[PDB]
Design an enzyme around this catalytic site. Structure first.
Site, mmCIF file in Angstrom:
data_model
loop_
_atom_site.group_PDB
_atom_site.id
_atom_site.type_symbol
_atom_site.label_atom_id
_atom_site.label_comp_id
_atom_site.label_asym_id
_atom_site.label_seq_id
_atom_site.Cartn_x
_atom_site.Cartn_y
_atom_site.Cartn_z
ATOM 1 C CD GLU A 1 17.613 16.176 83.065
ATOM 2 O OE1 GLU A 1 16.900 16.567 84.015
ATOM 3 O OE2 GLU A 1 18.828 16.454 82.984
ATOM 4 C CG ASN B 1 25.487 17.902 80.892
ATOM 5 O OD1 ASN B 1 25.864 16.742 80.870
ATOM 6 N ND2 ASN B 1 26.267 18.889 81.280
ATOM 7 C CB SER C 1 21.589 7.256 63.733
ATOM 8 O OG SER C 1 22.285 7.140 62.475
ATOM 9 N N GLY C 2 18.631 8.556 63.972
ATOM 10 C CA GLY C 2 17.329 8.519 64.570
ATOM 11 C C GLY C 2 16.773 9.871 64.935
ATOM 12 C CD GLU D 1 19.740 14.482 79.298
ATOM 13 O OE1 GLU D 1 19.903 15.587 79.841
ATOM 14 O OE2 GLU D 1 19.788 13.398 79.912
ATOM 15 C CG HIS E 1 20.026 2.530 61.892
ATOM 16 N ND1 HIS E 1 19.705 3.694 61.229
ATOM 17 C CD2 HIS E 1 20.943 2.872 62.831
ATOM 18 C CE1 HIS E 1 20.391 4.698 61.754
ATOM 19 N NE2 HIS E 1 21.143 4.231 62.737
ATOM 20 C CD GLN F 1 24.936 19.147 85.864
ATOM 21 O OE1 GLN F 1 26.096 19.192 86.271
ATOM 22 N NE2 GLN F 1 24.270 20.227 85.474
ATOM 23 C CG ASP G 1 16.970 3.770 59.022
ATOM 24 O OD1 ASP G 1 16.497 3.124 59.986
ATOM 25 O OD2 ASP G 1 18.151 4.216 59.008
HETATM 26 S S1 LIG Z 1 23.828 7.520 62.206
HETATM 27 O O1 LIG Z 1 23.912 8.126 60.908
HETATM 28 O O2 LIG Z 1 24.258 8.295 63.330
HETATM 29 C C1 LIG Z 1 24.710 6.008 62.193
HETATM 30 C C2 LIG Z 1 26.147 6.299 61.725
HETATM 31 C C3 LIG Z 1 24.044 4.996 61.206
HETATM 32 C C4 LIG Z 1 24.705 5.486 63.665
HETATM 33 O O3 LIG Z 1 25.683 5.776 64.349
HETATM 34 N N1 LIG Z 1 23.638 4.813 64.060
HETATM 35 C C5 LIG Z 1 23.635 4.404 65.436
HETATM 36 C C6 LIG Z 1 23.246 2.982 65.637
HETATM 37 C C7 LIG Z 1 22.499 2.392 66.664
HETATM 38 N N2 LIG Z 1 22.423 1.078 66.375
HETATM 39 C C8 LIG Z 1 21.788 -0.029 67.157
HETATM 40 C C9 LIG Z 1 22.765 -0.516 68.170
HETATM 41 C C10 LIG Z 1 23.863 -1.258 67.763
HETATM 42 C C11 LIG Z 1 24.747 -1.747 68.695
HETATM 43 C C12 LIG Z 1 24.516 -1.469 70.010
HETATM 44 BR BR1 LIG Z 1 25.743 -2.161 71.301
HETATM 45 C C13 LIG Z 1 23.449 -0.725 70.444
HETATM 46 C C14 LIG Z 1 22.572 -0.252 69.515
HETATM 47 N N3 LIG Z 1 23.113 0.889 65.212
HETATM 48 N N4 LIG Z 1 23.608 2.014 64.769
HETATM 49 NA NA NA Z 2 20.837 15.799 81.894
#
Ligand SMILES: *S(=O)(=O)C(C)(C)C(=O)NCc1cn(Cc2ccc(Br)cc2)nn1
Ligand code: NA
Length: 240
Positions: free
Chosen positions: A69, A61, A188-189, A59, A45, A64, A93
């Site tokens: 990095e 911080n 996430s990820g 990484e 996702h 900074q 996922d």
């Molecule tokens: S995770 O459990 O942290 C959760 C809540 C599903 C999350 O926050 N996922 C992060 C995420 C990243 N993306 C792709 C995306 C969407 C929109 C933009 Br502007 C950039 C990247 N979708 N959820």
């Molecule tokens: Na940094």
């Protein structure tokens, strides 16, 4: 990470920050795990939006440069072919990112250790989540990498009616749910690191939290179970 503490510098040297281009700068969106010098494991996702991505290894911080990095482009995205963006709860996922160049390994940049295929942890096994995700529900990202102790909640408990019910599958790992400590948006990820035979291995890829809040009792953070995907991961790396 809600209810975490600041990690020691690069004690989690396989953790990466996945960032997307935002104007003339970069924005952190997800974690990931470095699994080869030129491959990162993340959540499918995290790449649902078609953006320019980069990976930051070493990484700590986000605001900074500390001299540790390395910043690298993403050259190929391989999402699990069964992933359905409209059905997170079905699982799958997981995605692999081939990096535009191979990063250099050092004390700050190391490959994450994956579990043996099929490994299922006993209930309440010792694990840590790490990430730069929100430090409170509806809050803001952490400037410095956070960690939280998040012991597992086994499938029987996690998929019962007072937890996640049918939404959690056996291809997922649940951890936490004490109402204080959890993953949160932007974790996430990233990895769930679990101690097995004295060595931490990345058993989870952070997948989702409750829409009711990050730290919610009996809504543990839910992770893709890495050990269900070992053959898939190896097949992808071998054919790319
Ligand atoms: S995770 O459990 O942290 C959760 C809540 C599903 C999350 O926050 N996922 C992060 C995420 C990243 N993306 C792709 C995306 C969407 C929109 C933009 Br502007 C950039 C990247 N979708 N959820
Ligand atoms: Na940094």
């Amino acid at each position: 990470v809600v209810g975490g503490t600041e990690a020691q510098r690069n004690s989690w040297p396989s953790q990466i920050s996945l960032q997307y281009r935002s104007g003339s700068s970069w924005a952190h969106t997800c974690g990931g795990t470095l699994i080869r010098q030129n491959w990162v494991m993340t959540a499918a996702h995290c790449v649902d939006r078609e953006l320019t991505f980069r990976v930051v290894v070493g990484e700590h911080n986000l605001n900074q440069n500390d001299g540790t990095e390395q910043y690298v482009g993403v050259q190929k995205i391989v999402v699990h072919p069964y992933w359905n963006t409209d059905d997170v709860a079905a699982g799958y996922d997981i995605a692999l990112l081939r990096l535009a160049q191979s990063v250099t390994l050092n004390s700050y940049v190391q490959l994450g250790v994956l579990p043996r295929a099929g490994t299922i942890l006993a209930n309440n096994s010792p694990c840590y989540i790490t990430g730069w995700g929100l430090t409170r529900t509806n809050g803001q990202l952490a400037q410095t990498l956070q960690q939280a102790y998040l012991p597992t909640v086994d499938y029987a408990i996690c998929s019962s009616s007072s937890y996640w019910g049918s939404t959690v599958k056996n291809s997922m790992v649940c951890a936490g749910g004490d109402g204080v400590r959890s993953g949160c948006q932007g974790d996430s990820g990233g990895p769930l690191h679990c101690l097995v035979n004295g060595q931490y291995a990345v058993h989870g890829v952070t997948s989702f939290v409750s829409r009711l809040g990050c730290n919610v009792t009996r809504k543990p953070t839910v992770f893709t179970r890495v050990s269900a995907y070992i053959s898939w991961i190896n097949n992808v790396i071998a054919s790319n």
